[PDB]
Amino acid sequence: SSTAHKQQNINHLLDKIYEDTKYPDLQEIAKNFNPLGDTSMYNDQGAAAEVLMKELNDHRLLEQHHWYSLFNARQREEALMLFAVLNQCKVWHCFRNNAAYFREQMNEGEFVYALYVGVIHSKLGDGIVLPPLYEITPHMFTNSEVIDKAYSAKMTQKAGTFNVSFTGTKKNKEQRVAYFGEDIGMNIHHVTWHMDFPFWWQDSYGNHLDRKGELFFWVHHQLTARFDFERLSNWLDPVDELHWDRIIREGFAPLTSYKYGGEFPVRPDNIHFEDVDGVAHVHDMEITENRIYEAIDHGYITATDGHTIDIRQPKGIELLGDIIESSMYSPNAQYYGSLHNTAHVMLGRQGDPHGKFNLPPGVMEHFETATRDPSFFRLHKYMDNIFKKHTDSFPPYTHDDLEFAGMVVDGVAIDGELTTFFDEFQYSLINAVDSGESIEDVEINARVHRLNHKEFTYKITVSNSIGSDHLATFRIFLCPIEDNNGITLTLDKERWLCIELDKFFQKVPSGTHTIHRSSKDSSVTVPDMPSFHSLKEQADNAVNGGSDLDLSAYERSCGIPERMLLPKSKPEGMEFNLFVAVTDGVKDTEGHNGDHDHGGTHAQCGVHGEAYPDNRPLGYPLERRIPDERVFDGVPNIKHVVVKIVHHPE
Amino acid sequence: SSTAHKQQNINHLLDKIYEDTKYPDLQEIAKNFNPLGDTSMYNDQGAAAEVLMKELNDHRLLEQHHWYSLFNARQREEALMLFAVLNQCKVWHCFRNNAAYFREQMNEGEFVYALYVGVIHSKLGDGIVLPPLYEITPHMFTNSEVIDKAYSAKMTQKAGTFNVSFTGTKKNKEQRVAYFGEDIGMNIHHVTWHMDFPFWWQDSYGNHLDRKGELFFWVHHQLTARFDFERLSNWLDPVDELHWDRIIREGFAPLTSYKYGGEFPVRPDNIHFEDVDGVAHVHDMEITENRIYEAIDHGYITATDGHTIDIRQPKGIELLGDIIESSMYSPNAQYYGSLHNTAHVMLGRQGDPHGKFNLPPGVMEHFETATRDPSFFRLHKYMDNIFKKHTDSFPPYTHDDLEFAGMVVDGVAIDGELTTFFDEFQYSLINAVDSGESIEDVEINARVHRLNHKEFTYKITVSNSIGSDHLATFRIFLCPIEDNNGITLTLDKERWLCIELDKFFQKVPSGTHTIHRSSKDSSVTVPDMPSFHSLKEQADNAVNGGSDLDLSAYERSCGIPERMLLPKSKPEGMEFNLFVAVTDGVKDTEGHNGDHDHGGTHAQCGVHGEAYPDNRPLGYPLERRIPDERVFDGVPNIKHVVVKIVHHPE
Ligand SMILES: *[C@@H]1O[C@H](CO)[C@@H](O)[C@H](O)[C@H]1NC(C)=O
Ligand SMILES: *[C@@H]1O[C@H](CO)[C@@H](O)[C@H](O)[C@H]1NC(C)=O
Ligand SMILES: [Cu+2]
Ligand SMILES: [Cu+2]
Ligand SMILES: [Cu+2]
Ligand SMILES: [Cu+2]
Ligand SMILES: [Mg+2]
Ligand SMILES: [Mg+2]
Ligand SMILES: [O]
Ligand SMILES: [O]
Ligand SMILES: [O]
Ligand SMILES: [O]
């Protein structure tokens, strides 16, 4: 019931997840605990526990040792039944005991999902650090070749560390950017964002997820823009957008497998979409798309009873994210459907669209794996352009809109060269292999090459010519100067390609002062996850003894990995525009304070258990059309400078 | 150097083929034997050993733990270099020592292939029974799910027997006939036929393979006709033929994996052929096809210098098989290419035709696996129709052609009901899993359901009204009466669909006599292979002690499995025409004797180390057009009767 004991409990529950628990205390609980024995431990007096126990007793739950997809409606419903129980627990012993009990009864994929979102969305989970999913379920992050070497290492009872190479061949130009969507941390960022902001969320679970639909737009806009920056760095053109009536040019072979369920399916190059039995017809996707664009071009969403909901206003983008994803916040799912989530399944199933071949779900049908597929970025550019029609519909900002009166950016510079490189990172495959009973384990690791960069610090010189210190928001973006054809981009053509590097609030005293901000402190990024082995060691050292470790150290798992803050760029160097906008922090943070702690990842992942701290539209001030660059040049609190990034190859 | 010791040596060499040998004697030989140390052990005084050793010493051979395809030109060349050495050994110690030495140096797939064809084509191999390849390399015969359970059984050190189900789902109508092409014995029949009659054979290896090109036509004609009989039994239409300019309707997901190389690739439904980089353009296949048909319709094959080779003669079909397969017997590979073998690769590679995805060869690129793919039978019907244009070009047989004067078939009947069913068969997966060092093995088996039938005996009453006993050939075929639409077939429309059930030579004494022939004695079929475990036990029992076991018991591994002699048919029963032709055995066997032993599989697999014993065209007397059924009805030595086959489901 302390953080050390809770962390250890979670560590134990997630250990060797494909086998019955090996911890005597958890075995005893799974044997003897009755989820219905004392309903006073629940806030709903047992309602959720009754629902799940009835499903269990009627033999209606998915078996153990079976693939699980969050996009599968019934499997999701089953996972959410366990989430609902955990979420109702008043105290930790309820949470732990129900987790231990249902770990041994329910499908492992459902259980892991429910336990993670249960920890994230319950106050009882505060202070717990979830192990990286690439060590809890390594199959979802590790190609089949390396798993086989792990299987071989286990079959032969010999330790080893095995190198993971990217999918494809050098003949496949898309392999040039495999280090983006295949990065294990980028995959954790993506799954964790959706765990923090789930489309199935209903506020009856206990609280509201502030601005979720707009953050849904923004986080995926940033994934798309970041991927395109890697393409530009590797002599590739931007991704095309998907369209339902045109071929998906770039196929994909994941070369990965489920632990149970077989190899992930492949998609050949240059295929037309086919209807997917049990999911949707291609034509249904076109109609859904049309209906969303009808709302955007009408300027209003149509409610279930036909009345209009105005979207010509700052929350319009959020309501659009609600209906596009779609989430349970959608005002009218009967009419607007679920374009984005259904599209994930439509794409994921194109290797077996009629269920003739007994193929498991595609990589697009899991947030753990979706960015590994090149078609992820074609789909999300397509979706991004829907949002962009709405954001482009507003009048361009004026001088008066943008000016922070009395605040001028005199200069922008960086301390330290902008240098990227690849280094090596290891994670454990032990959870992927079968052990027991009464046979000892051996160390089995994967080694991956990952993008990284050297530390740097921004130097932003501002002059506050008001006679008072003022809170300011510093908004930092990296923008392309030229496209892959060497063509110089206008600001209007740059703005939608810019990637967010940082956003922070800082008091600017009167006078001229230099603000320093380290790359490591970015509110866009989070560090590499601590290893499962490290979390066990720290939790065990605390429990066996008694030591209050400041676990309030790790960031969150949602956020672009720190190592991927910068695009790869080129060995010969590339020049980019570093764009800084300094805006009125008093107005931006009204209702959430400026001195308050906002965590390490508020730019795209918000603040755990709090409202979103920045009132401005996501992407401000680049999210509206800029047809006249003179407007931005005339605003003293906006400035961009040219910076150079060099890739250091091996 | 005796059969017991040779069998044990082979057993040891093939044991746990993915790991260094565990037998101390073979380890010593691999360490100390010099293939170039005493050239007097070779018939070529070491020429072949020098070629292979140079390749080995120059690091030019395929690494161990890598996929192998006989259709890969360079990998085949490497395997054949080892075959060439084994084939030159004068005595067994040369054969054994070179096998042991190169087992530890060469790729395991190349080694197994070379060792099998070396045993088959060397007189030193006489009396050896090769273990079934499904136990030597189980990955090539076992779906990935079951291998994973084997991997799990090994990782956990627990014995088990695991059920293999057919690929696909019940929504896939092609799964109705998966028991044909996925039968492990049918796969061994196919690989062994090609090992007995390899397209790479050159007579400089020591002997000629009699009528090989015509047997190539015939064995594949019979595979195609037998598959279509299973389709008819399961309410399916006949397979369509492939065409290079039309879609391949039926895709395929093997759900199988290589031990090294990854999962076998899938082919989606309804794809057009694409050019395959490094293999051929689709257009090249069309041109090759056209050139073959030009020879057929000209009535002659064009030699390299332009002179004509007449094919309007009994050996024409053989020369066509030579140029179509193509084999090294082809008179003009520069012009006629290799339609059939290239088509195997063209089909096999359609999941990755441009090498972008790092996918290993398809199931069509191994004789072990090719019949698992539905497209196998569409390709081979296409090829079969090329041969049929030639065979249809000859004048129909006349009464005088067909009559065996003084020999009448008075009656045809069967002792015993014709009943099919499915039963269970087990084979070991131990060679598929990793062991060692110094850790004990455990029993790991696959259980498959396989077609089978009850024993029956033909009763053929003949009257020999010549005043002398006469040798006769009994030719027995099963022919459809109606197609899948309930339409009654004419004899001309039946004949190409008939399947060979038996062919035997027997002296018919003067008078009226009943000939009895058991289904078990069919010259078309061979029994199930003895298990690797059984072969080890019998060889070990002989070596450790001294006992001359009549190993001259097992048939061969080439031949339709006995269990698959009859089509499945239907639970409600199906009627077929049983066609018996009794022909002049003196003329049919001229040059090969009648009383001589022809083995158990001469109909399609010939006689090991001897000429083909039947002079008639393969398929006689059904291989020419029969436009006038009156001709066959007027021949007393031909008779057909209606028989019923019933399937007994579980
Ligand atoms: C794996 O990578 C490490 C460093 O990244 C290297 O030392 C080692 O040689 C590699 N192993 C293999 C088998 O290539
Ligand atoms: C496997 O098949 C056997 C007989 O074919 C049967 O007894 C057994 O129940 C099957 N096992 C499973 C797990 O279905
Ligand atoms: Cu997402
Ligand atoms: Cu998405
Ligand atoms: Cu063949
Ligand atoms: Cu073939
Ligand atoms: Mg299922
Ligand atoms: Mg290779
Ligand atoms: O997403
Ligand atoms: O996504
Ligand atoms: O073949
Ligand atoms: O074949």
Give CA–CA dist B354/B639, Å, rounded.
54
A509-529: string of b/e by CB count within 10 Å (b at 16+)? eeeeeebebebeebbbbbbbb
| AA identity, residue A404 | F
Question: Using beta carbons and an 8 Å cutoff, which residues of A are at the interface with B?
Answer: 144-145, 151-152, 154-157, 167-169, 171-172, 251-253, 255, 257, 262-263, 265-266, 268-269, 271, 351-352, 354-359, 433-437, 439
Q: Which helix (H) or strand (E) holds A160?
A: strand A160-164
Q: Residue A153 — φ and ψ, nearest 5°? A: -60, -40
Specify the DSSP class assigned to residue B482: B
Give CA–CA dist B8/B5, Å, rounded.
5
Q: Where are the beta strands (DSSP E) in B119-220?
A: 160-164
Q: Which of B340, B305, B304, B306 is nearest to B325 (CA)?
A: B340
Strands A457-464 and A407-415, how do they pair?
antiparallel
CA B85, B88, B90, B91 dihedral sign is: positive
Alpha-carbon distances, residue A316 vs A201, A216, A299 (angstroms):
20, 13, 9
Q: Which of A290, A257, A237 is nearest to A483 (CA)?
A: A237
Same domain, A172 and A293: yes
Chain A interface test: which of B252, B260, B266 (most A C-beta within 10 Å): B266
Three-state SS for A295?
helix
CA of residue B69 relative to chain centroid, distance: 17
Task: Give the residue on B whose Cα is nearest the Cα of A66.
Answer: B145
Q: Are B355 and B276 in contact (CB under 8 A)?
A: no
Task: List CB contacts (< 8 A) between B151 and chain A.
Answer: 151, 155
Q: Are A579 and A633 in contact (CB under 8 A)?
A: no
Give CA–CA dist B149/A273, Å, rounded.
35
Q: How far is A146 from chain B, CA to nearest CA, in Å?
A: 10
**Residue B301 pairs with which residues in a beta bridge?**
B309
Q: Are B408 and B511 in contact (CB under 8 A)?
A: no
Give CA–CA dist B114/B195, Å, rounded.
10
**Residue A164 pairs with which residues in a beta bridge?**
A448
Three-state SS for B348?
helix
Alpha-carbon distances, residue B164 vs A238, A329, B234, B362 (angstroms):
46, 46, 21, 21
Q: Where are the beta strands (DSSP E) in B234-388?
A: 300-302, 308-310
Which residues contact residue B116 at a Cβ distance below 8 angstroms, ignoring those fewer than 6 apart?
Answer: B130, B133, B195
Task: List CB contacts (< 8 A) between B439 and chain A.
Answer: 156-157
Contact across the interface for A266 and B144, Cβ inside 8 Å:
no
Three-state SS for A25?
helix
C-alpha neighbours within 13 Å on the C-beta side of residue A404: 28
Alpha-carbon distances, residue A154 vs A132, A133, B360, B428, B578 (angstroms):
22, 21, 25, 21, 56
Identify how many contiguous H helices and E strands chain A contains and give both numbers: 22, 14
Same domain, A3 and A37: yes
For ligand 1, atom 9, the nearest C-alpha belongs to A163
Please report where in the chains the tokens 């740097």 appear, as a residue. A456
Specify the DSSP class assigned to residue B271: B
Give CA–CA dist B512/A158, Å, rounded.
74
Task: Give the residue on B whose Cα is nearest the Cα of A144.
Answer: B262
Q: Is A645 left (phi over 0), alpha (psi -120 to 50) or beta?
A: beta
Alpha-carbon distances, residue A592 vs A539, A558, A595, A601, B324 (angstroms):
34, 21, 9, 16, 80
Same domain, B483 and B599: yes
Give CA–CA dist A604/A559, Å, rounded.
7
Q: Which atom of ligand 1 is nearest to the CA of A161?
A: 1
Strands A418-428 and A638-647, how do they pair?
parallel
Task: List CB contacts (< 8 A) between B356 and chain A.
Answer: 168-169, 171-172, 251, 269
Alpha-carbon distances, residue A6 vs A52, A275, B516, B559 (angstroms):
24, 47, 81, 66
The 3-class secondary structure across B61-115, one letter per residue, is CCCCCCCCCCCCHHHHHHHHHHHHHHHHECCHHHHHHHHHHHHCCCCHHHHHHHH
| AA identity, residue A632 | F
Indicate the top mutation candidate among B163, B422, B423 to test ligand 2's pocket, ranked by most ligand atoms within 8 A of CB: B163
Alpha-carbon distances, residue B269 vs A350, A353, B170, B374 (angstroms):
11, 10, 16, 11
Same domain, A513 and A587: yes
Three-state SS for A632?
helix
Q: Where are the beta strands (DSSP E) in A173-314?
A: 300-302, 308-310
C-alpha neighbours within 13 Å on the C-beta side of residue B317: 26
Contact across the interface for A359 and B434, Cβ inside 8 Å:
no
Edge-to-edge, what's the strand order for the sheet holding A407-415? A407-415, A457-464, A511-518
Cis amide leading into A77 (omega within 30)? no
Same domain, B38 and B86: yes
CATH code of the domain covering residue B465:
2.60.40.1520
Q: Which helix (H) or strand (E) holds A410?
A: strand A407-415
CA of residue A606 relative to chain centroid, distance: 12
Give CA–CA dist A166/B319, Å, rounded.
49
Distance from the alpha carbon of residue A214 to the mean position of ligand 5, in angstroms: 60
Give CA–CA dist B629/B481, Å, rounded.
14
Give CA–CA dist A635/A454, Å, rounded.
32
Indicate the top mutation candidate among A162, A163, A425, A447 to test ligand 1's pocket, ranked by most ligand atoms within 8 A of CB: A163
Ligand 2: lining residues by beta carbon, under 6 Å: B 163, 424, 447
Give CA–CA dist A522/A503, Å, rounded.
7
Give CA–CA dist A42/B159, Å, rounded.
45
CA of residue B517 relative to chain centroid, distance: 24
Give CA–CA dist B396/B527, Å, rounded.
37
Same domain, A181 and A314: yes
Contact across the interface for A255 and B262, Cβ inside 8 Å:
yes
Cis amide leading into B437 (omega within 30)? yes
Q: Are B409 and B639 in contact (CB under 8 A)?
A: yes
Q: Are A419 and A646 in contact (CB under 8 A)?
A: yes
Q: How far is B354 from chain A, CA to nearest CA, in Å?
A: 9
| AA identity, residue B602 | H
Give CA–CA dist B253/B251, Å, rounded.
7
Helices (H), A255-338: 282-298, 316-325, 333-336
Q: Which helix (H) or strand (E) holds B136?
A: helix B133-136
Same domain, B106 and B207: no
Strands A418-428 and A407-415, how do they pair?
unpaired
Same domain, A433 and A473: no
**Residue B537 pairs with which residues in a beta bridge?**
none
Question: Using beta carbons and an 8 Å cutoff, which residues of B are at the interface with A?
Answer: 144-145, 151-152, 154-157, 167-169, 171-172, 251-253, 255, 257, 262-263, 265-266, 268-269, 271, 351-352, 354-359, 433-437, 439
CATH code of the domain covering residue B240:
1.10.1280.10
Please compute Rg for chain B using Cα positions. Answer: 25
Same domain, B191 and B270: yes
Give CA–CA dist B535/B127, Å, rounded.
13
**Residue B252 pairs with which residues in a beta bridge?**
B267
For ligand 2, atom 1, the nearest C-alpha belongs to B163
Specify the DSSP class assigned to residue A396: P
Count Cβ atoms below 10 Å from residue A40 Cβ, excluding itself: 8
Q: Are B52 and B82 in contact (CB under 8 A)?
A: yes
Q: How far is B160 from chain A, CA to nearest CA, in Å?
A: 15
Distance from the alpha carbon of residue B113 to the mean position of ligand 11, in angstroms: 16
Which residues contact residue B349 at a Cβ distance below 8 angstroms, ignoring those fewer than 6 apart?
Answer: B276, B279, B361, B362, B365
| AA identity, residue A59 | H
Q: Which atom of ligand 1 is nearest to the CA of A163?
A: 1
Please report where in the chains the tokens 């895709």 appear, as a residue. B251
CA B169, B175, B178, B179 dihedral sign is: positive
Q: Are B485 and B217 in contact (CB under 8 A)?
A: no
Q: Which of A499, A546, A505 is nearest to A524 (CA)?
A: A499
Three-state SS for B473?
strand
Residue B649 buriedness (CB in 10 A; 0-12 / 13-18 / 19+): exposed
- Copy the structure tokens of residue B163: 């059920």
Same domain, A19 and A81: yes
Q: Which of B258, B279, B262 is nearest to B109 (CA)?
A: B258
User: Which range marks the domain in which residue A173 is found?
Assistant: 167-393
For ligand 1, atom 7, the nearest C-alpha belongs to A163
Give CA–CA dist A593/B587, Å, rounded.
107
| AA identity, residue A362 | G
CA A88, A92, A95, A97 dihedral sign is: negative
- Copy the structure tokens of residue B407: 């020999």
Please compute Rg for chain A using Cα positions. Answer: 25
What's the CA angle centered on B347, arms B341 and B348, to 5 degrees? 90
Q: Are B213 and B292 in contact (CB under 8 A)?
A: no
Q: Is A396 left (phi over 0), alpha (psi -120 to 50) or beta?
A: beta
Three-state SS for B229?
helix
Three-state SS for A301?
strand
To one decimal, the resolution in angstroms is: 1.6
- Copy the structure tokens of residue B2: 């005796």
Three-state SS for B194?
helix
Count Cβ atoms below 10 Å from residue A1 Cβ, excluding itself: 12
Q: Residue B514 — φ and ψ, nearest 5°? A: -100, 120
Please report where in the chains the tokens 């005199």 appear, as a residue. A410
Q: Which of B135, B148, B111, B120 is nearest to B184 (CA)?
A: B135
Written as one string, the DSSP assignment of A26-41 is: HHHHHHH--TTS-GGG
Give CA–CA dist B279/B349, Å, rounded.
9
Count Cβ atoms below 10 Å from residue B308 Cβ, excluding itself: 12
Contact across the interface for A439 and B151, Cβ inside 8 Å:
no
Q: How far is B511 from chain A, CA to nearest CA, in Å?
A: 60
Nearest-by-Cβ selection for A434 from B152, B352, B433: B152
Give CA–CA dist B235/B570, Å, rounded.
9
Written as one string, the DSSP assignment of A53-102 is: HHHHHTT-SPPSSS---TTSHHHHHHHHHHHHHHHHBSSHHHHHHHHHHH
Cβ(A163) – ligand 1 distance below 6 Å: yes
> End-to-end distance of chain A based on CA atoms, in angstroms?
48
- Torsion angle in degrees (nearest 10) through CA of A583, A586, A592, A593: 120
Count Cβ atoms below 10 Å from residue A637 Cβ, excluding itself: 21
Q: Which of A642, A554, A614 is nearest to A211 (CA)?
A: A614
Angle between helices A339-348 and A316-325 (to 10 degrees): 40
Residue A590 buriedness (CB in 10 A; 0-12 / 13-18 / 19+): exposed
Same domain, B224 and B348: yes
Distance from the alpha carbon of residue B130 to the mean position of ligand 9, in angstroms: 55
Q: Are B496 and B619 in contact (CB under 8 A)?
A: no
| AA identity, residue B229 | F
3-state helix, strand, coil in chain A (%, to 5): 40, 20, 45
Give CA–CA dist A581/A583, Å, rounded.
6
**Residue B577 pairs with which residues in a beta bridge?**
B479, B642
Same domain, A408 and A323: no
- Copy the structure tokens of residue A136: 């809890």
Q: Which helix (H) or strand (E) holds B221?
A: helix B212-233
What's the CA angle centered on B367, arms B362 and B370, to 5 degrees? 50
Count Cβ atoms below 10 Å from residue A313 Cβ, excluding itself: 12
Q: Which technique was used to obtain these atomic coordinates? A: X-ray
Give CA–CA dist A194/A558, Å, rounded.
9
Identify how many contiguous H helices and E strands chain B contains and give both numbers: 22, 14
Edge-to-edge, what's the strand order for the sheet holding A638-647? A160-164, A444-453, A418-428, A638-647, A574-584, A470-480, A499-508
Q: Are B373 and B347 in contact (CB under 8 A)?
A: yes
Distance from the alpha carbon of residue B161 to the mean position of ligand 2, in angstroms: 9
Q: Which helix (H) or strand (E) holds A144?
A: helix A144-155
Count Cβ atoms below 10 Å from residue B457 Cβ, excluding itself: 14
Q: How many domains does chain B have?
A: 3
Q: Residue A633 — φ and ψ, nearest 5°? A: -65, -25
Which residues contact residue B65 at a Cβ distance below 8 angstroms, ignoring those fewer than 6 apart?
Answer: B18, B108, B259, B260
**Residue A475 pairs with which residues in a beta bridge?**
A503, A581
Q: Are A269 and A251 in contact (CB under 8 A)?
A: yes
